[PDB]
């Protein structure tokens, strides 16, 4: 929430990427801002960080010569630049905030210091690929007599042929959360991703309540809203 990150994007091998992190409090205070990455389906690894107030920055040797950390007080935004990107740099890059209550200093007592992260950003998935981005085609999974059970109807959106990940889906701009199931994407033979998001609602609401899926695909700078309704006979 109070830690906003830049959007997901595809980057060509050999290029550089800059991931931003904005503290929504309008200030860095004495917080340190770190970057931790995670390859989809795998673990976490610390990359480095910077404590603006002290102008101190460091990182993991694994990234020596490839990373730079900066912070702009004016915009309360911290940045990490990673260069000479390769396919194995594909990962969700998380901004993680750390603090240090050292009795008015950076770090000097009580026990352990500023190594843990109490607040994380939503992450920025950077995909390193030579293939270009492609926005999704969104089709309705219209509720019908074939998708009802009791006084419940299922409906959804099929999000087809996009690249690369990720795609996020909300319903009615976040006003609808209960009963929602968004499936993990599958990589089709075409090399493009596909996923679907479904929701179950009261059949009696189908004629009065509008249902719209909000599909966001930051890599292609696309947002698609698709109203889903019973099909006409």
């Amino acid at each position: 929430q109070l830690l906003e990150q830049s959007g997901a994007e595809v980057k060509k091998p050999g290029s550089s990427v800059q991931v931003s992190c904005k503290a929504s409090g309008g200030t860095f205070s004495m917080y340190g801002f770190n970057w931790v990455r995670q390859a989809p389906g795998h673990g976490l690894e610390w990359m480095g960080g910077i404590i603006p107030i002290f102008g101190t920055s460091n990182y993991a040797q694994k990234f020596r010569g490839r990373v730079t950390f900066t912070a702009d007080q004016a915009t309360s935004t911290a940045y990490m630049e990673l260069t000479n990107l390769r396919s194995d740099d594909t990962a969700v890059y998380y901004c993680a905030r750390d603090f240090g209550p050292d009795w008015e200093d950076g770090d000097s007592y009580d026990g352990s210091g500023r190594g843990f992260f109490d607040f994380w950003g939503q992450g920025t998935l950077v995909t390193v690929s030579s293939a270009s981005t492609k926005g999704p085609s969104v089709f309705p999974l219209a509720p019908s007599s074939k998708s009802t059970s009791g006084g419940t109807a299922a409906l959804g959106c099929l999000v087809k042929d996009y690249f690369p990940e990720p795609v996020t889906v909300s319903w009615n701009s976040g006003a609808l959360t209960s009963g929602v199931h968004t499936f993990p994407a599958v990589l089709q033979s075409s090399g493009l991703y596909s996923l679907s998001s479904v929701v179950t609602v009261p059949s009696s609401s189908l004629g009065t309540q509008t249902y719209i899926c909000n599909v966001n695909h930051k890599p292609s700078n696309t947002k698609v809203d698709k109203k889903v309704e019973p099909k006409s006979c």
Partner: protein, 215 residues
Amino acid sequence: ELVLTQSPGTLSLSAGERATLSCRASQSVSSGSLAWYQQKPGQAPRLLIYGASTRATGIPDRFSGSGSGTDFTLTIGRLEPEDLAVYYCQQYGTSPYTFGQGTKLEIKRTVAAPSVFIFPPSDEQLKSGTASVVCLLNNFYPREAKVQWKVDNALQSGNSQESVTEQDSRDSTYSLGSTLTLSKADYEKHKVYACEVTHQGLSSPVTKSFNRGEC
């Protein structure tokens, strides 16, 4: 560099039981500078414990941390279904900070049969030359389920793909979406499209179908 090894890789427990997660370090962790994080499906990590035993603000009293030196433990006293997640330990006593490989916590629950729904392809999609027929299996438990597609009673193979959600944070069930993909031509040359589902919660396989051209 300090290597953190977590155990077990996967933990399978029912709600109400106690979870014990281990994190062992290759070298002594300075000042007990060990943190634990919880990462729920599709979410960013969340701090649970720091300083090895200090519960973070806003964290439930069922979470506790212990340990010193090279041996640390995260205990979840009485598991709640919402605890479904991957848990990671991290040491920050020495640079570079390092994380354990994580422990996946799965929740066991009673059997639950899926509700099955079918969706014919949209005319919009068909127009472009492709027909995606979708079968939805909703809220079932044993993850194991079988979906068999049939077109005019002919069993299909090699032309469908399925995806399963992670366990639901509230009822620990799964949902599965199977998509049969055909060219517009093949789709329009057949009439009956059926999805047959087999699951432990069902006394017999149930089939959902529709005839192309019917309302």
